[PDB]
Amino acid sequence: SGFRKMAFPSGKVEGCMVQVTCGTTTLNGLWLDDVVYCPRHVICTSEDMLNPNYEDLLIRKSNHNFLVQAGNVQLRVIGHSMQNCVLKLKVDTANPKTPKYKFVRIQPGQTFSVLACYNGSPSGVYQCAMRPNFTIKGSFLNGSCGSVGFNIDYDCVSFCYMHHMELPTGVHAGTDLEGNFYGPFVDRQTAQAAGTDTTITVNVLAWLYAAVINGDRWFLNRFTTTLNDFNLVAMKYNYEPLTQDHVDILGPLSAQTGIAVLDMCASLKELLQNGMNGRTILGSALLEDEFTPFDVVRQCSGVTF
């Protein structure tokens, strides 16, 4: 028993982190097979970042302008190119610690583990969700660019996030590992802002199921509702709409607990309309929305990697 915000074990990813230095800029890179991946803004001076022409800036660079350090070993760069907003540095040695991996692009509401890194050295791990407004509420300081987010499935690491920028509200923006930004952001030092965010409804429901599994059930009630009626309530309280796909996805938890999704939706409606009566759920006084249905099943069943 117990229920914690839980990250994947990070060892498979720690062996892939390297330091990338270009001129006076140092940040992190991801070393897989014989390529190191990092943000393309590594090649910009601070004045460059105000309005960069990345193709033109990269022409001035040669392989020896990129200093790549894996632990205490220098890696030899033998090629360089861009894919969208990521720089790809070909090196002369394949990473012997490359795990089974793939590159995936996630959707808002999905969660992942972040390995925060500085100067190529892993410093912390925590769990994040891709927000509906395509930001993540991470914890990053200067030097953290190039830190990555990932999920693990059996033996395969699925990389889904590379860190690029901090926005003025203190939330974070980045790309998938093919260099495509999440959200309407660009890698330029210019006026940009997170849009208004919403609450991830299917995840709040998943966490209520986790609460019931862990013996917290004061919010259950005799009522049920319909998808159409509930979605009017969700809209009023700035929650994402609930689809039939979400109901089906909550299947395994609705089986493990034996409570119907629209049954639980009636509980959530009452919590939205009335609040918590000075009570808590799983140690929180807020409705938590960064646990997916799969996260709840994963933690309550003890899956290993």
CA distance 169 to 94: 39
300 in catalytic set: no
Strand order in the sheet with 35-39: 73-75, 66-70, 17-22, 25-32, 35-39, 86-91, 77-83
CB of 297 to a copy of itself, least distance (A): 12
Q: What size, in residues, is the chain?
A: 305
Check binding of 73 to a copy of itself (CB under 8 A). no
165 touches, from ligand XFD, a copy of itself, none (C-beta below 5 to 8 Å by class): ligand XFD
| Catalytic entry in 16, 38, 85, 145 | 145
41 in catalytic set: yes
Check binding of 21 to ligand XFD (CB under 6 A). no
- Indicate the residue whose CB is closest to ligand XFD: 145
Nearer to a copy of itself, 36 or 128 (CB): 128
Q: What is the DSSP string of 97-119?
A: TPPSEEE----TT-EEEEEEEET
Strand partners, 30: 17, 37
Contact 146, 178 (CB under 8 A): no
User: Which residues 268-287 are close enough to bind ligand XFD by CB under 6 A?
Assistant: none
Contact 289, 129 (CB under 8 A): yes
27 touches, from ligand XFD, a copy of itself, none (C-beta below 5 to 8 Å by class): ligand XFD
Question: Quick check: helix, strand or coil at residue 266?
Answer: helix
| Catalytic entry in 41, 80, 164, 172 | 41
Which of 141, 154, 245, 274 binds ligand XFD (CB under 6 A)? It is 141
Contact 266, 226 (CB under 8 A): no
Residues in contact with ligand XFD, shown as a per-residue x/- string from 73 to 112 under the rule CB under 6 A: ----------------------------------------
Residues 6+ away with beta carbon under 8 Å from 74 = 67, 68
Which of 21, 25, 133, 299 binds ligand XFD (CB under 6 A)? It is 25
Contact 264, 303 (CB under 8 A): no
Nearer to a copy of itself, 166 or 263 (CB): 166
Sole window of 48-56, 65-73, 180-188, 277-285 interacting with a copy of itself (rule: CB under 8 A): 277-285
Long-range contacts of 278-281 (CB under 8 A, 24+ apart): 279/218, 281/207, 281/208, 281/211, 281/216, 281/219
CA distance 198 to 204: 12
CB of 169 to a copy of itself, least distance (A): 8
Check binding of 168 to ligand XFD (CB under 6 A). yes
The binding site for a copy of itself (CB under 8 A) comprises 1-12, 14-15, 115-119, 121-128, 137-144, 166, 170-172, 214-215, 280, 283-286, 298-305
Residues with catalytic function: 41, 145
